[PDB]
Design a protein around this ligand. Structure first.
Ligand SMILES: [Hg+2]
Ligand SMILES: [Hg+2]
Ligand SMILES: [Hg+2]
Length: 9
């Protein structure tokens, strides 16, 4: 989950 946020942005 965390990585998805960082990747997204
Ligand atoms: Hg990305
Ligand atoms: Hg990524
Ligand atoms: Hg990058």
């Amino acid at each position: 989950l965390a990585a998805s946020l960082a990747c997204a942005l």
